Short mmCIF file of C-alpha atoms and ligand atoms in Angstrom, two decimals:
data_model
loop_
_atom_site.label_atom_id
_atom_site.label_comp_id
_atom_site.label_asym_id
_atom_site.label_seq_id
_atom_site.Cartn_x
_atom_site.Cartn_y
_atom_site.Cartn_z
CA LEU A 1 -13.22 10.05 49.51
CA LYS A 2 -10.32 9.72 51.94
CA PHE A 3 -7.89 12.20 52.61
CA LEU A 4 -3.65 11.43 52.05
CA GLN A 5 -1.91 15.07 52.53
CA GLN A 6 -2.65 18.39 51.88
CA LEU A 7 -0.82 19.90 48.48
CA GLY A 8 -1.39 23.47 48.19
CA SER A 9 -7.01 24.72 49.89
CA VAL A 10 -6.28 21.95 47.77
CA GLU A 11 -5.68 18.05 49.15
CA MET A 12 -4.47 14.93 47.74
CA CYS A 13 -7.37 12.39 48.36
CA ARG A 14 -8.50 9.22 47.91
CA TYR A 15 -11.51 7.94 45.70
CA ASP A 16 -11.80 4.50 47.14
CA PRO A 17 -15.66 3.43 47.16
CA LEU A 18 -14.37 0.27 48.96
CA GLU A 19 -8.46 6.23 42.30
CA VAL A 20 -5.74 8.93 43.08
CA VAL A 21 -7.51 12.63 43.17
CA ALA A 22 -7.01 16.51 44.08
CA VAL A 23 -9.66 18.12 46.04
CA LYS A 24 -10.03 21.62 45.79
CA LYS A 25 -12.09 23.18 49.04
CA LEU A 26 -12.76 26.91 51.05
CA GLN A 27 -11.15 28.06 53.20
CA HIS A 28 -13.69 30.69 54.83
CA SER A 29 -16.95 29.52 53.04
CA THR A 30 -18.89 32.90 52.50
CA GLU A 31 -21.55 33.72 50.23
CA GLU A 32 -19.15 35.60 48.31
CA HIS A 33 -16.81 33.22 47.89
CA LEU A 34 -19.21 30.34 47.26
CA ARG A 35 -20.62 31.98 44.31
CA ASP A 36 -16.86 32.90 42.93
CA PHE A 37 -16.01 29.18 43.94
CA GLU A 38 -18.65 28.02 42.20
CA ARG A 39 -18.36 29.43 38.53
CA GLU A 40 -14.25 29.12 39.02
CA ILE A 41 -16.02 25.19 39.20
CA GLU A 42 -17.97 25.97 36.02
CA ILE A 43 -14.91 27.17 33.88
CA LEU A 44 -12.69 24.66 34.66
CA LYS A 45 -15.86 21.90 34.01
CA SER A 46 -16.18 23.77 30.19
CA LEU A 47 -12.30 23.41 29.55
CA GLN A 48 -10.81 20.20 28.06
CA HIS A 49 -7.46 20.15 26.75
CA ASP A 50 -4.36 18.30 27.06
CA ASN A 51 -2.55 21.53 29.33
CA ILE A 52 -5.17 22.03 31.05
CA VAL A 53 -5.89 20.14 34.37
CA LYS A 54 -8.74 17.59 34.24
CA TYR A 55 -11.65 18.60 36.26
CA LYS A 56 -13.45 14.79 37.42
CA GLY A 57 -16.12 15.94 39.11
CA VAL A 58 -18.06 18.02 42.68
CA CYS A 59 -18.26 16.62 46.44
CA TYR A 60 -21.74 18.27 47.93
CA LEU A 61 -18.56 22.19 48.09
CA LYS A 62 -15.78 20.51 47.01
CA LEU A 63 -14.14 20.20 43.43
CA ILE A 64 -12.42 16.89 42.09
CA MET A 65 -9.44 17.32 39.62
CA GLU A 66 -6.50 15.13 38.90
CA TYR A 67 -3.90 14.78 40.32
CA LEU A 68 -0.43 16.12 38.99
CA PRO A 69 2.32 14.06 40.95
CA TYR A 70 5.39 16.33 39.95
CA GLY A 71 3.65 19.27 41.73
CA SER A 72 4.27 23.17 40.18
CA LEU A 73 6.53 23.63 38.10
CA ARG A 74 8.70 25.68 40.33
CA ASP A 75 9.25 22.68 42.54
CA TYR A 76 10.18 20.89 39.57
CA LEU A 77 12.18 23.34 37.78
CA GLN A 78 14.29 24.02 41.05
CA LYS A 79 14.84 20.67 41.49
CA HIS A 80 15.95 19.19 38.16
CA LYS A 81 17.58 22.82 36.79
CA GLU A 82 20.24 20.76 35.78
CA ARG A 83 18.68 18.44 33.23
CA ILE A 84 16.39 21.16 31.47
CA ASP A 85 18.30 22.15 28.47
CA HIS A 86 16.61 25.27 26.45
CA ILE A 87 14.52 22.67 24.31
CA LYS A 88 12.61 21.63 27.45
CA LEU A 89 11.92 25.10 28.37
CA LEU A 90 10.51 25.56 25.32
CA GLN A 91 8.76 22.43 25.15
CA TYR A 92 6.55 23.62 28.32
CA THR A 93 6.28 27.22 26.69
CA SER A 94 4.41 25.71 24.07
CA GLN A 95 2.30 23.53 25.84
CA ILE A 96 1.47 26.61 28.17
CA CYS A 97 0.88 29.48 24.95
CA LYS A 98 -1.56 26.43 23.31
CA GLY A 99 -3.25 25.47 27.14
CA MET A 100 -3.71 29.80 26.56
CA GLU A 101 -4.55 29.49 22.88
CA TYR A 102 -7.09 27.56 23.80
CA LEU A 103 -8.76 29.42 27.17
CA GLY A 104 -9.18 32.54 24.63
CA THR A 105 -11.50 30.21 22.13
CA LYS A 106 -13.93 29.98 25.22
CA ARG A 107 -13.03 34.40 26.15
CA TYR A 108 -12.34 33.18 29.15
CA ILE A 109 -9.72 35.32 31.10
CA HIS A 110 -6.97 33.60 33.75
CA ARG A 111 -5.33 36.68 35.37
CA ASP A 112 -3.09 34.94 37.61
CA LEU A 113 -0.43 33.45 34.72
CA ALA A 114 2.64 32.18 36.47
CA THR A 115 5.43 29.31 37.14
CA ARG A 116 3.27 28.80 40.57
CA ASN A 117 -0.27 28.17 38.46
CA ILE A 118 1.68 26.05 36.34
CA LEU A 119 1.70 22.04 37.14
CA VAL A 120 3.80 19.28 36.05
CA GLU A 121 2.45 15.40 34.87
CA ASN A 122 5.89 13.71 34.27
CA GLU A 123 9.06 15.23 32.77
CA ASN A 124 7.27 16.02 28.82
CA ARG A 125 3.77 17.60 30.16
CA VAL A 126 2.93 20.44 32.07
CA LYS A 127 -0.95 21.97 32.55
CA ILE A 128 -2.13 24.85 33.58
CA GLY A 129 -3.37 24.62 37.30
CA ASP A 130 -5.46 26.60 39.01
CA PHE A 131 -8.32 28.97 37.62
CA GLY A 132 -9.21 30.74 40.70
CA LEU A 133 -8.97 34.00 39.30
CA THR A 134 -9.94 33.04 36.09
CA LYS A 135 -12.96 35.38 34.57
CA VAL A 136 -15.35 34.91 31.44
CA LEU A 137 -15.55 38.19 29.47
CA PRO A 138 -18.64 40.13 29.18
CA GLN A 139 -20.71 40.15 25.61
CA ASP A 140 -20.01 43.80 25.83
CA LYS A 141 -16.59 44.06 26.06
CA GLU A 142 -12.61 42.20 24.98
CA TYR A 143 -12.10 43.35 29.00
CA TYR A 144 -12.93 42.33 32.53
CA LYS A 145 -12.55 44.71 35.05
CA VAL A 146 -11.66 43.77 38.65
CA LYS A 147 -10.76 45.93 41.35
CA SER A 148 -2.43 41.63 43.31
CA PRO A 149 0.94 39.67 42.06
CA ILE A 150 1.76 43.10 40.48
CA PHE A 151 4.94 42.09 39.14
CA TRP A 152 3.03 40.19 36.85
CA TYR A 153 0.58 43.04 35.58
CA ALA A 154 0.16 44.38 32.22
CA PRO A 155 0.27 48.54 32.66
CA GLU A 156 -3.11 48.79 32.11
CA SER A 157 -4.69 46.20 34.92
CA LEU A 158 -2.41 48.23 37.06
CA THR A 159 -3.78 51.37 36.10
CA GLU A 160 -7.59 50.45 35.03
CA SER A 161 -7.57 47.40 36.80
CA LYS A 162 -8.38 45.73 33.15
CA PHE A 163 -7.81 42.06 32.29
CA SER A 164 -7.99 41.02 28.47
CA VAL A 165 -6.57 38.23 26.43
CA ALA A 166 -3.48 41.13 26.09
CA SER A 167 -2.98 41.73 29.75
CA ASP A 168 -2.50 37.83 29.82
CA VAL A 169 0.00 37.65 26.87
CA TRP A 170 2.20 40.54 29.28
CA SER A 171 1.55 37.68 32.17
CA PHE A 172 3.10 34.84 29.72
CA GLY A 173 6.26 37.41 28.78
CA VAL A 174 7.33 36.87 32.42
CA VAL A 175 6.44 33.37 32.61
CA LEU A 176 8.71 33.22 29.85
CA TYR A 177 11.11 35.03 31.68
CA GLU A 178 10.74 32.56 35.13
CA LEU A 179 11.31 29.74 32.47
CA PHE A 180 14.58 31.19 31.17
CA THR A 181 15.72 32.58 34.61
CA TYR A 182 15.42 28.82 35.94
CA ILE A 183 13.41 30.42 39.13
CA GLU A 184 16.10 31.14 40.13
CA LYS A 185 14.80 33.51 43.19
CA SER A 186 17.61 36.14 43.07
CA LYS A 187 16.47 36.97 39.79
CA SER A 188 12.41 36.75 39.99
CA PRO A 189 10.15 39.23 38.55
CA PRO A 190 9.67 41.21 42.22
CA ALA A 191 13.84 40.76 43.05
CA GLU A 192 14.39 42.47 39.70
CA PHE A 193 11.57 44.91 39.43
CA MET A 194 12.62 45.88 43.22
CA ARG A 195 16.05 46.45 42.62
CA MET A 196 14.89 48.62 39.94
CA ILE A 197 12.96 50.64 41.16
CA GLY A 198 14.93 50.98 44.60
CA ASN A 199 15.10 49.62 47.75
CA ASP A 200 14.24 52.93 49.35
CA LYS A 201 10.55 52.45 49.76
CA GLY A 202 3.39 49.53 49.26
CA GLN A 203 1.05 51.65 46.95
CA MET A 204 4.65 53.60 46.58
CA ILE A 205 5.71 50.30 44.47
CA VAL A 206 2.77 50.48 42.39
CA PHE A 207 3.40 54.02 41.87
CA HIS A 208 6.65 53.39 40.78
CA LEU A 209 6.37 50.10 39.17
CA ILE A 210 3.90 51.74 37.00
CA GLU A 211 6.64 54.29 35.92
CA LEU A 212 9.06 51.95 35.18
CA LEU A 213 6.97 50.33 32.88
CA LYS A 214 5.76 53.58 31.16
CA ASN A 215 9.48 54.96 30.91
CA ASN A 216 9.91 51.48 29.09
CA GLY A 217 11.82 49.95 31.86
CA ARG A 218 11.79 46.01 31.74
CA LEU A 219 13.63 42.90 32.95
CA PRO A 220 16.73 42.20 31.61
CA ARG A 221 17.28 39.25 29.28
CA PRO A 222 18.38 36.55 31.52
CA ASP A 223 21.65 35.13 31.57
CA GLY A 224 22.15 32.13 28.84
CA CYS A 225 18.64 33.20 27.42
CA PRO A 226 18.76 33.41 23.72
CA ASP A 227 18.26 36.90 21.70
CA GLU A 228 14.93 35.30 20.05
CA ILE A 229 13.36 34.34 23.25
CA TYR A 230 14.02 37.38 24.62
CA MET A 231 12.57 39.26 21.87
CA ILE A 232 9.48 37.31 22.57
CA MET A 233 9.05 38.31 25.88
CA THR A 234 9.82 42.19 25.29
CA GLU A 235 7.18 42.32 22.07
CA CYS A 236 4.67 40.02 24.74
CA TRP A 237 5.57 43.81 26.93
CA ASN A 238 4.53 46.07 25.02
CA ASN A 239 2.83 49.25 26.79
CA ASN A 240 0.46 49.17 23.37
CA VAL A 241 -1.78 46.57 23.98
CA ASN A 242 -2.38 46.27 20.16
CA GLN A 243 0.93 45.36 19.70
CA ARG A 244 1.09 42.87 21.50
CA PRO A 245 1.28 39.31 19.91
CA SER A 246 -1.52 36.42 20.06
CA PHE A 247 -1.35 33.23 21.76
CA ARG A 248 -1.69 31.58 18.51
CA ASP A 249 1.25 33.17 16.86
CA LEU A 250 3.55 32.76 20.04
CA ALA A 251 2.58 29.37 19.80
CA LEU A 252 3.75 28.68 16.33
CA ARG A 253 7.26 31.28 16.63
CA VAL A 254 8.15 28.52 19.99
CA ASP A 255 7.64 25.74 18.22
CA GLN A 256 9.62 27.17 15.21
CA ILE A 257 13.06 28.54 17.48
CA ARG A 258 12.53 24.75 19.14
CA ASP A 259 12.58 23.02 16.27
CA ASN A 260 15.67 25.24 14.48
CA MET A 261 17.29 24.67 17.61
CA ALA A 262 17.12 20.87 18.13
CA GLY A 263 17.73 20.67 13.73
CA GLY A 264 20.34 23.21 14.04
CA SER A 265 18.93 26.09 12.72
C1 U8J B 1 -0.98 25.94 42.11
C2 U8J B 1 -1.69 26.48 43.08
C3 U8J B 1 -3.00 25.63 43.53
N1 U8J B 1 -2.52 24.35 43.58
C4 U8J B 1 -3.17 23.21 43.00
C5 U8J B 1 -2.48 21.79 43.59
C6 U8J B 1 -2.38 20.07 42.70
N2 U8J B 1 -1.15 20.18 42.90
C7 U8J B 1 -1.07 18.73 42.76
N3 U8J B 1 -0.24 17.40 43.01
C8 U8J B 1 1.14 17.75 43.47
C9 U8J B 1 1.23 19.33 44.35
C10 U8J B 1 2.34 19.78 45.00
C11 U8J B 1 3.44 18.43 45.19
C12 U8J B 1 4.59 18.51 46.04
O1 U8J B 1 4.94 20.06 46.63
N4 U8J B 1 5.54 17.45 46.63
C13 U8J B 1 6.64 17.47 47.45
C14 U8J B 1 3.12 17.08 44.54
C15 U8J B 1 1.57 17.34 43.68
N5 U8J B 1 -2.29 18.29 41.74
C16 U8J B 1 -3.23 19.03 41.39
N6 U8J B 1 -4.63 18.70 40.55
C17 U8J B 1 -4.99 19.98 40.59
C18 U8J B 1 -4.57 20.85 41.10
C19 U8J B 1 -3.40 20.29 42.17
C20 U8J B 1 -1.79 22.75 44.64
N7 U8J B 1 -2.13 23.64 44.50
#
């Protein structure tokens, strides 16, 4: 393994036993973080899906994965904005949904779904690309309690530190918002929420975000975003956990909308 460049810590290396892979290493190799990293490796090893970054092995502790040359979807969408139409955005949306559907069949909770964690293999394929916060659900519950990127958090994650497939669905709604704002920073969830809360404010931000969400304040419909797509976002952002859609139903709806858009309805 020959170091080439740092990517994210994550590095680009050459595994040439006399070949390009991504290598995740730990910054502060403590006992607590090593135990977490060990579980992250097992989680990624257990996942085989076209839209999940491919596990390749371990090094003595280093995590070896396939190298995805277009980097994160944020950098990619920013650089290629003008040539990424809505049908393409929904192609990525569908692939993220199906990755999350598959994650759900293992009873894994991702807990960090955001465009920053999606990587781009090529113009036609994106992959969920980091699993550093992912939890395996306990046998006795449908949620995991963990004591943060608050502007992607479901209300019950903010108030009770509870994470579930349903809170992943909320965060997917925010991902869909990020895509249809073309990840413009002035439109980003943090910028929008801070303007809605009022820039007259740390812990107080979380307080006012909770109050805002409880009063059904929401991120606005992005410019140019079709109503059917904004409707999916708002269904993901239901305060009632039981009312949020499943990833399987989201995948089917996104595919139908994409096909309708391409065919002229
Ligand atoms: C998502 C947060 C953690 N993280 C994961 C990675 C990662 N990156 C990449 N490729 C990559 C990255 C950046 C750039 C770039 O910026 N070029 C100007 C180009 C290619 N392949 C990966 N395979 C497995 C993980 C991983 C980086 N950070």
